[PDB]
Amino acid sequence: HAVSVGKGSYATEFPEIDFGGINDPGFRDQQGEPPATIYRSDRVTGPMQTNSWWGSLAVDRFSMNQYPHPFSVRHRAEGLHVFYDAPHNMVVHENREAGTWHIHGAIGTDFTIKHSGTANFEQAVVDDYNDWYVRGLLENGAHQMAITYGVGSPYIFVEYEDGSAVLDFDIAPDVWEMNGHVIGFSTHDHKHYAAFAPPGQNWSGIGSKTLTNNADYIAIAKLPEKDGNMLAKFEQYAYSVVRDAVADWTYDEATGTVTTTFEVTTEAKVQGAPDGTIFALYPHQYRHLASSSENQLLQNYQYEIIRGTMIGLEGKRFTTELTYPGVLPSLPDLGDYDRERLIGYLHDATSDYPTGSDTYELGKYIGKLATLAPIADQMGEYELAEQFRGELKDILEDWLQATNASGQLKGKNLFYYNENWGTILGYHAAHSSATRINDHHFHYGYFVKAAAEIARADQEWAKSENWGGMIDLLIRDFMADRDDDLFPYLRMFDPYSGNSWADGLATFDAGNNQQSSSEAMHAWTNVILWAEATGNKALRDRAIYLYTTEMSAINEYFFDVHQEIFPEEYGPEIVTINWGGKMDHATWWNSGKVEKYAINWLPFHGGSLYLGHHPDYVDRAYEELRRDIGSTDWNLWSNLVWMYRAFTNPDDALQQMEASIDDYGLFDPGNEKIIERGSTKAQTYHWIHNLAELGRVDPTVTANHPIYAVFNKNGNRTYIVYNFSDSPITVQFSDGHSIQVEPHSFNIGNGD
Numbered sequence: 001h002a003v004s005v006g007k008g009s010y011a012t013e014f015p016e017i018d019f020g021g022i023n024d025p026g027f028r029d030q031q032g033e034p035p036a037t038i039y040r041s042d043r044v045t046g047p048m049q050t051n052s053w054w055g056s057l058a059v060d061r062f063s064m065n066q067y068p069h070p071f072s073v074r075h076r077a078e079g080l081h082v083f084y085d086a087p088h089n090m091v092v093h094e095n096r097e098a099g100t101w102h103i104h105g106a107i108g109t110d111f112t113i114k115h116s117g118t119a120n121f122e123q124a125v126v127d128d129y130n131d132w133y134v135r136g137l138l139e140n141g142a143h144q145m146a147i148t149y150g151v152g153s154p155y156i157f158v159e160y161e162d163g164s165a166v167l168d169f170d171i172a173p174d175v176w177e178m179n180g181h182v183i184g185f186s187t188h189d190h191k192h193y194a195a196f197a198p199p200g201q202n203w204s205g206i207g208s209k210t211l212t213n214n215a216d217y218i219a220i221a222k223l224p225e226k227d228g229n230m231l232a233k234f235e236q237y238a239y240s241v242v243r244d245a246v247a248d249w250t251y252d253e254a255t256g257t258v259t260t261t262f263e264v265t266t267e268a269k270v271q272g273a274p275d276g277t278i279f280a281l282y283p284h285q286y287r288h289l290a291s292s293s294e295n296q297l298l299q300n301y302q303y304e305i306i307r308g309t310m311i312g313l314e315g316k317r318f319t320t321e322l323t324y325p326g327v328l329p330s331l332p333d334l335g336d337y338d339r340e341r342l343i344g345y346l347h348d349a350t351s352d353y354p355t356g357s358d359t360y361e362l363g364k365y366i367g368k369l370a371t372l373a374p375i376a377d378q379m380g381e382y383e384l385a386e387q388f389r390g391e392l393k394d395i396l397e398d399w400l401q402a403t404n405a406s407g408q409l410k411g412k413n414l415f416y417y418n419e420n421w422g423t424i425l426g427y428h429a430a431h432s433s434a435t436r437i438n439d440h441h442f443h444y445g446y447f448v449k450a451a452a453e454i455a456r457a458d459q460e461w462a463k464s465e466n467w468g469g470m471i472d473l474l475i476r477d478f479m480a481d482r483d484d485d486l487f488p489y490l491r492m493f494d495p496y497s498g499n500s501w502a503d504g505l506a507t508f509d510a511g512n513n514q515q516s517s518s519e520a521m522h523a524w525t526n527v528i529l530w531a532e533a534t535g536n537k538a539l540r541d542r543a544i545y546l547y548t549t550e551m552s553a554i555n556e557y558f559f560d561v562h563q564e565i566f567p568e569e570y571g572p573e574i575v576t577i578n579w580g581g582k583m584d585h586a587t588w589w590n591s592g593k594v595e596k597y598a599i600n601w602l603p604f605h606g607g608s609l610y611l612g613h614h615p616d617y618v619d620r621a622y623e624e625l626r627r628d629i630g631s632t633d634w635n636l637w638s639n640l641v642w643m644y645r646a647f648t649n650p651d652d653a654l655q656q657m658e659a660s661i662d663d664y665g666l667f668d669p670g671n672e673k674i675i676e677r678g679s680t681k682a683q684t685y686h687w688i689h690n691l692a693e694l695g696r697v698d699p700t701v702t703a704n705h706p707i708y709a710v711f712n713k714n715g716n717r718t719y720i721v722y723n724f725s726d727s728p729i730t731v732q733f734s735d736g737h738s739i740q741v742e743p744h745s746f747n748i749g750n751g752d
């Protein structure tokens with residue numbers, strides 16, 4: 001009933017849960033498993049993909065509404081509904097009393113793609129998928145309709161078995177170009193589309209509500225404009241059905257460059273169809289397009305979507321280039337703090353305890369301890385640092401064992417492998433981490449943080465045959481490489497959308513969602529640190545790719561740093577929750593004003609410096625939150641606002657901190673006014689004083705090793721490197737600066 005992995009183990013049978021006398025139905029229902037039924041064909045075997053834009057197809061009998069941008073679609077018994085949010089469909093609404101804003105479209109139908117033989121399909125299943133397309137299969141015995149579609153595809157490819165094509169409309173469309181087998185058409189409300197069949201298979205029903213074609217293959221395209229030259233271009237790739245799609249990446253450690261090539265492989269549905277497609281690129285992609293891909297752009301081919309403007313690009317592949325900025329295990333000892341006051345705060349933190357038994361609340365607590373230990377080391381409090389790391393070891397050694405002293409499965413504080421889907425679930429569970437396969441990056445990221453801090457001081461503990469095997473198992477659950485026998489590829493991450501999706505099932509009409517982009521970045525940071533500490537280059541580089549790509553998405557869709565994506569009428573300077581089909585300034589729980597910003601900042605750690613790359617954004621967002629609050633009397637989590645403010649104005653952050661940090665004493669679960677419960681006074685005090693001495697984050701300088709940061713105060717740069725090696729190293733920076741770093745240390749600010 002359990003599998004040994006080094007000194008640890010995971011359960012292979014669902015445990016008999018220890019509820020601890022808690023009768024609350026919500027809590028009890030969390031200690032379960034994901035759905036027994038997976039709507040996939042017998043062509044889809046092995047660990048099932050989750051946390052995808054398309055997941056509702058796998059979980060629901062049919063599907064819920066999905067956003068393969070530029071389209072929205074949904075599977076039904078009658079066929080596939082297709083929709084496009086035009087400007088008249090989009091709204092921006094504010095609820096002043098709730099403090100919420102919503103940018104959204106409609107759940108309409110422009111037309112339904114149908115099968116001539118049936119409008120009563122039994123189910124829709126996942127029949128194939130790749131890095132960002134899916135093949136959905138509507139099934140009714142001999143009648144089948146296979147639909148291939150994806151984020152960043154302006155095509156929907158339709159393949160029929162035992163029937164032919166039908167497009168059904170509630171109001172008759174305007175067919176403005178009739179080329180026989182190819183038609184350009186518009187909905188009654190002027191949305192422009194095209195349909196393509198093989199030569200000789202001509203469309204019928206023009207002028208009526210129902211367009212028909214005898215072919216066993218059609219493609220639908222969303223056209224950027226009512227334009228026959230564009231229709232002719234779409235015709236060129238309309239018979240090249242996407243079968244494979246991969247996002248392959250490299251990390252150039254010398255330059256920091258992360259290069260990602262998106263490549264499709266198509267199957268020809270007519271003689272001579274080219275191996276390629278027309279991609280629709282998101283802002284985070286085209287703003288970083290490689291020079292070599294520029295010639296493939298279709299300049300005037302634009303689509304408006306929730307995420308701004310998509311642009312067309314033709315061919316087999318395209319490439320993006322990003323800059324990995326480094327991460328640190330902790331900020332070093334460079335602040336102008338009262339060392340005795342900080343030491344006092346470090347000892348105060350021994351009063352802290354987890355506010356629940358689930359993986360998330362336990363996670364927040366071990367993240368807190370892992371953050372305190374390096375600061376204790378810096379202050380010369382080696383014995384206190386050892387207490388914290390000893391507490392981390394005791395917790396991890398408990399959770400990473402599935403069996404008790406007798407050899408039977410435990411009822412809590414363990415991990416279990418669900419074989420049906422192929423995922424590691426932790427009990428106790430919360431936020432539907434087990435029942436919906438939610439948030440595995442958010443939760444397990446904190447476990448990796450604890451492991452990485454242990455590994456920084458104790459390489460032996462972190463060896464695979466000891467406790468490292470189980471940590472590497474948790475990491476595989478949420479970010480596996482290809483051909484992993486237990487887990488699907490990069491579970492959390494959508495390589496094309498550029499962000500992680502938090503919900504395992506995606507059974508919402510807005511598609512999938514992500515709230516805390518900062519907890520995702522925290523997970524990626526901790527894997528970089530863990531992998532560096534344990535000598536695992538392939539793992540480290542994968543986490544670098546994730547960190548850097550997620551950052552590009554965050555700056556577009558959560559922050560809109562370029563002031564191009566959010567509608568002008570949208571008041572806030574942040575989107576709290578990104579969905580496939582909408583954007584919310586709102587939280588998953590009932591909160592106040594600060595939390596709707598700070599849930600995309602927390603936790604603060606050595607990988608948080610990405611938050612300060614755009615100082616005008618940091619100012620703009622802070623100022624808007626301050627305007628809405630009406631003062632610096634933060635409704636909750638004051639310390640997070642101060643730490644954020646320190647990215648651009650550490651003097652202001654310092655005066656706010658001095659005025660209120662000691663308003664309350666030791667850890668109090670009921671009161672997060674001043675200190676958010678995953679944070680501490682020691683962390684807050686250490687952070688703000690470091691930023692005061694260091695100045696602004698400087699993203700214009702890179703290094704030829706991955707564990708570093710560069711700051712800039714009025715033209716004077718500070719270069720920080722941590723060296724995880726047993727040997728000394730030399731680090732070259734891109735501005736010509738060079739430093740030596742001794743084993744297991746920072747170059748500067750090691751402390752006592």
Ligand SMILES: OC[C@H]1O[C@@H](O[C@@H]2[C@@H](O)[C@H](O[C@@H]3[C@@H](O)[C@H](O[C@@H]4[C@@H](O)[C@H](O)O[C@H](CO)[C@H]4O)O[C@H](CO)[C@H]3O)O[C@H](CO)[C@H]2O)[C@H](O)[C@@H](O)[C@@H]1O
Pocket residue numbers: 064065098100507508509510511577584586587588589590591
């Ligand atoms: O922060 C403000 C308040 O936020 C509250 O949490 C909301 C949350 O309620 C919301 O969830 C909705 C889902 O309810 C919705 O489910 C649909 C089903 O109800 C329906 O029957 O079926 C369809 C599928 O066919 C479902 O989609 O789905 C939408 C997305 O499609 C969700 O948004 O999500 C909000 C974020 O978007 C979230 O803020 C919270 O509970 C309050 O405490 C808080 O005051």
Ligand SMILES: OC[C@H]1O[C@@H](O[C@@H]2[C@@H](O)[C@H](O)O[C@H](CO)[C@H]2O)[C@H](O)[C@@H](O)[C@@H]1O
Pocket residue numbers: 360364430431438439442443515516519588589602678
């Ligand atoms: O720790 C900050 C706040 O986190 C909130 O939970 C978030 C969830 O909405 C979501 O499921 O992802 C993770 C949890 O898995 C969190 O970011 C808590 O509800 C808040 O109590 C907490 O203050």
Ligand SMILES: *[C@@H]1O[C@H](CO)[C@@H](O)[C@H](O)[C@H]1O
Pocket residue numbers: 589672
């Ligand atoms: C988030 O945190 C608050 C307390 O800070 C709690 O009341 C909510 O239930 C939890 O989700």
